[PDB]
Symmetry: C5
Subunit: 312 residues, 5 copies
């Protein structure tokens, strides 16, 4: 088949719409995610009507090798999509309707700062090949684009799914400047993360801090060092689900602060024991009474400062 | 070949039946599972008989490129199934029998709350393409649908395998409203999970609780903190088989409760030691006698409350 | 080409033989294993001789698209095998010889109870398609079936490789009842498992038991709890190679027994310390003298009972 | 189609240009990396003009099966690239422009010494097949080669992207000596590595060193050995992201030095305790006062020597 | 096309040569390795010259579908190789030159005893299909076979790359007895393994042995048991890179010996404490003085015996 011939130099407008079905496999190390969805195409096909007789008002059904199907390519994909044509129904007026299912892998960038309370935005880009009959300009219709409201992407909630028109902005472009940008906004559910991670760390830190009400040097050493070992083990456990991040993060800053606090506690215990051995009990008592109030207040202030710095 | 022509506007009814062979690879992180099974198709083929002579009562054998094979697509799959035609035998009356083997990947949602005692339900959806001769409506026959009763899906037991008819409920539909829903019910075998997980945790918790019959502060500290380290290590071991779950779970609630109990035990030991140092032995003795009864009763009540909350 | 026409209603007998080459990748979580082997086919081809002249006694060489190659399908495979025809030589008498190499994935069930001393049996099923000329019945010849005696499946030893005839036993069958069952028996080499796993656990348990010859409560607590931590760490190390098993196992029973023994030892130490504090040294001495003989004998008896229960 | 015939024995010069789009999946164990990019081809096509009429100054659009597309193969790839032709536009003058998108896997060597502060250089090699019309020599144009400046390769920064001409230097070559070498320079961002790895190790080492201000043998033993256990656990945590390296590395040297320092500290503590037991307190006091200054200075000098050795 | 006809019953000799390019992905669990290399073919093609005119001394260039390309199959591969023809140049004399690039997966057996100082030998087998014109016998030429001397297989060094002729030795053979065996010898670089594994284990063992110069039972117990825990953790760390080996190994024997030494040290400490409690200090002093010399000498002798046993 051949593309429709021009009529009055009117640009060929193709209305594109993506209907989401399933979103899954949000890989973080590879920064990829697999998507399975539909695709709706509807282009003007005047001067090439298919039996427009009023007595033949029945919807015309055709095959892929019957008329010119426009060629649309995805930019940020690893390979060509698996096209699965479902139905091709065209009204006798001339408007063609096309539906298919595809499952491709999309390359989109992900930022994991503000990890426990982050929001992501996925992008899908579409490019239509040029033709020798008349330039084709992509248009977005708000009726076909949408989602089934049953996306099984666990751990995230979908806020919106829109599409706009943007220039190609490619150094190798010649005439194509009508790419499409589909934006999907998701938000992470952070309810379980608090009891899963934050509270046990605070409990271990408080258990370590309980050494300021004691005097036995051996008991204090055992408490502090064993709590440090427990903290290291819990960090090893936490690192299993956390993705590899080659930049600073809120959780990493918190962990570093906890390490610093453990070091300061060790120093304080050593100083207290040294003073007690050197037989200056008044200074040791004053230091150990001051630390009980000094540590929690400084910890809270540092946490507030870090939260303000990382969340505006 | 071409689809059979209409006769008296009677809708073409296709009887579909899936015969399970092997179910395996129940991936939880991807929320997928691979299935290998048969597929039986039988559609009315009147006015296109194949030598209906009584002397030719022998069963007719044909090839895939001999007659019109109906096109059936799966909705919740990553890609097209691997069709492997086994036999195509049609009686001289006109009824056609079709059998094939396929191995596709199915996308079905899985809930892991009530994890150790959960029950899952897998869904498979079928859609038949429309044709220009007469609308095709899917029908389910109870004879062909079934299982070999030798499914090697370890860790689960199959209760039933039924199929019903449901509307398409798609925003892009035009006339298709005859999707099929195959429901597979499975139940997890929880016998080994008790000795594998629950009992060692209780043993470690009781070992930690054995510190209420002692008076040595160093011994109590060693017991409690080392049992905390052992609990963390056992949690790390348990997390290997548990799937990633971005929501609350019964096991997670139990683990959080155990952490809270460890923290409370540390606080109680510290208070007892502080009282003994401050030379008020009566209060310390009363507290340490009360705790022996207080801890197990509160633990049992909390476990009962959690079980009632998570299991209706 | 076309299948040979019938002569005197004699069923077409096809002699099948599988020659193993390489067996590898015995996946346990997926319960699969990849096999690379040969395949020998020899069927009667009378009335379709290929130059049976005595002066042309030279062996005839043909291509896959020269004569009718029988179609054989594997039942317990994920997808169609990769057929690689090596040679097709047919004698002038009429007997055809066919050889090819394939590498498919086989789905076979594996039982891991009696794990360290278990024996497995792999099954491969073959089905021949029916034809419209004369029913084909599969036959097994003992000359072509065999192995190269150089199977590189490490950790296992091959005992036998036989094949028998069994009914199809399928609910969807029509006339096919001549499936083939190839049985491969393997045995696990358990020599290294003893020094790799069993002996260190016994050493740690004995180190824990060395606390019955001491009196220091702090030393006994340290010994027992630190040995418990070491046991947990060693269990974590062991779990790396052990496959996921959703049912009871000999090793799991042994580990549970070890946990129970640790708990009993903790209870005994606590009771001894409580008696010593309450100033009844005779009873404590009697208990600590009795335990030294009680623990090893009970451990040995329990191990004997478990071995008898799990090994008939 | 056929390649253009020669005119005046002038070698056919093909201008090649690669436009990067996405670089990702820098696998270290396999020493591979996947690249998705464009490819620009422009070759002289005189004597085969495509309607050079001035009134037909419109850009000519063709298909892959319209003219001779030069064949270019990649040397260091696992398999053939996935060619995805985007547009083929040729001016009426005779110059042809070709654009396509490919996603292949490149085999390039990676050196991980100087790991935290290393710089890598990736290579891509191109070879053009010989033809029977006239020898083809590859040329590099500086306009088409480039990058989109939006490479999402996290953890690295791109410095330059150039290309040069080099001899084939193959033992099997006959006449081809015009391979192309595309060099991509990247640098690792080392900011987060310092707080993620280096500082906690120093904190643990200092905590271990705090035992020189004490006299309790049990407390010193507990401190040193528990810090050794914590160091081993932290090394286990660090090894998760570090790639497998079968040669010496800066981090490995640092870890070995830390182990040696722990051993020396254990020896010093044992010697001090032995002297105190043997009742020579002056020597023990002198040794424990000297060690406080000896250890940090030696550690700093050793670190400086290692840094100078590994960084010129 | 058709194979060349026979001339004087002279066997067709094909000179084969493999030129290595990249060797990588030496998987140990699967016992496989991927290889990317060239392949040179040169067979006698007399009586089918391609314009042998002296004025046409120019090298003839052809396509794969121009002449008979001999069929060569690999025996120990999972699937057919990815053939990528580079150039087909034939001199007017009659000798044909063929070059291509392939990337297949090879199944070769690997022995990991003597692991840290082992040497491997990889094998590649080639089989040529028989033809009905004249028997083909494979020959090896020493000029085309070779390597680029730039193999990026890290951790190994290539010593030689030769090829010989061997009989097929297959039970299903008919006339083919001319298989080719390509042997690749590699040696592991063991420099980094010593500081990465061996020395920390010796340091931990010596730290454990430092308990023979002390008398505090609690300190000795803490030292020995905590060093045992550290040894278990280090073994867990080591097991990450070590491949799964279902047979005895030098490293496994060393680890078992270390466990036995830890057990003996625990027994000695317990005996010394029991004697001191029973008030026989002379015997305890004699035992603890003897052990200091007994342990290192026995350890060295056992290591020497193990090395002699495992290395001839
Ligand atoms: C480099 C690693 C150094 C680790 C620190 C080990 C020593 C810490 C305790 C020092 C101590 O007890 O000093 C005693 C001394 C009191 O004794 P006199 O001077 O007689 O009064 O303590 C003090 O009051 C001095 C202040 C001690 C803390 C200061 C910080 C020291 C460590 C800084 C590390 C920076 C990184
Ligand atoms: C790092 C900055 C640390 C600043 C605080 C160190 C000293 C705090 C101190 O002496 O205590 C002040 C005070 C409590 O007073 P007492 O301990 O009763 O005296 O502690 C604080 O408020 C901590 C300082 C908060 C602001 C900084
Ligand atoms: C923030 C992290 C705080 C950790 C808690 C460390 C201190 C716990 C022990 C306190 C203690 O011994 O108090 C002594 C004191 C008795 O001494 P006098 O008042 O002289 O009688 O104890 C008591 O009876 C008070 C009650 C103690 C427990 C109350 C809870 C404290 C911790 C709450 C943490 C919440 C999160
Ligand atoms: C969190 C809620 C904790 C409530 C219980 C704390 C105090 C329990 C107590 O004093 O013991 C009551 C009692 C035992 O009495 P004696 O210890 O002999 O006195 O303990 C309980 O029953 C625990 C409370 C159960 C219901 C809540
Ligand atoms: C629930 C978790 C409970 C953990 C057990 C902690 C207490 C164990 C030690 C008890 C103890 O010392 O009892 C002293 C007592 C002797 O003192 P008088 O009666 O004065 O003589 O000991 C005995 O002889 C009683 C028997 C002690 C062991 C019995 C088993 C107790 C634990 C059962 C747990 C079952 C699960
Ligand atoms: C669980 C069942 C535990 C039964 C054994 C508990 C008590 C054993 C005992 O008192 O020792 C008997 C005896 C040793 O005698 P003495 O310790 O010298 O007295 O121990 C045994 O034989 C253990 C019992 C074996 C059979 C059950
Ligand atoms: C390995 C080489 C170790 C050399 C240093 C060991 C002895 C250092 C010593 O006695 O201290 C010298 C000195 C500090 O003097 P005091 O301890 O007060 O005496 O320590 C150093 O400077 C360490 C040596 C640095 C250069 C080598
Ligand atoms: C089974 C697990 C058994 C673990 C061993 C625990 C006991 C070890 C210490 C025994 C002890 O102290 O014996 C004292 C005793 C001395 O006391 P009298 O006879 O009064 O002089 O010690 C000795 O001299 C006997 C020899 C002790 C070591 C012999 C080996 C014992 C363990 C063998 C385990 C084999 C596996
Ligand atoms: C296992 C075999 C263990 C043999 C050695 C055990 C006893 C060694 C001993 O008594 O020491 C001999 C001797 C050192 O003599 P003193 O300890 O001063 O006496 O030790 C050795 O040489 C160890 C034995 C080496 C050869 C066996």
């Amino acid at each position: 088949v051949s593309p429709p011939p021009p009529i009055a130099d009117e640009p060929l407008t193709v209305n594109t719409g993506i209907y989401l079905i399933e979103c899954y496999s949000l890989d973080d190390k590879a920064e990829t995610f697999k998507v399975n969805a539909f695709l709706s195409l509807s282009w003007k096909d005047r001067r090439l009507a298919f039996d427009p007789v009023r007595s033949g008002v029945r919807v015309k059904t055709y095959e892929p090798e019957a008329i010119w199907i426009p060629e649309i390519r995805f930019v940020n994909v690893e390979n060509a999509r698996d096209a699965d044509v479902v139905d091709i129904s065209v009204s006798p007026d001339g408007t063609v309707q096309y539906l298919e299912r595809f499952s491709a892998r999309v390359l989109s960038p992900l930022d994991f700062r503000r990890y426990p309370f982050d929001s992501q935005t996925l992008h899908i880009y579409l490019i239509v090949r040029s033709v020798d009959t008349r330039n084709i300009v992509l248009a977005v219709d708000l009726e076909k684009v949408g989602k089934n409201d049953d996306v099984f992407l666990t751990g995230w909630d979908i806020e919106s799914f829109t599409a706009v028109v943007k220039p190609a902005n490619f150094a190798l472009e010649d005439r194509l400047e009508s790419k499409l940008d589909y934006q999907l906004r998701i938000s992470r559910q952070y309810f379980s993360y608090i009891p899963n991670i934050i509270l046990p760390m605070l409990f271990i830190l408080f258990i370590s801090w309980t050494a300021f009400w004691s005097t036995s040097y051996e008991a204090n050493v055992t408490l502090v060092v064993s709590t440090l070992i427990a903290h290291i083990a819990f960090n090893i456990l936490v690192e299993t689900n956390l993705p590899k991040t080659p930049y600073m993060t809120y959780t990493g800053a918190i962990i570093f602060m906890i390490y610093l606090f453990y070091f300061v506690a060790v120093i304080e215990v050593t100083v207290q024991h040294y003073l007690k051995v050197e037989s200056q009990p008044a200074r040791a008592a004053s230091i150990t009474r001051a630390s009980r109030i000094a540590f929690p207040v400084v910890f809270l202030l540092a946490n507030i400062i870090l939260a303000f710095l990382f969340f505006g």
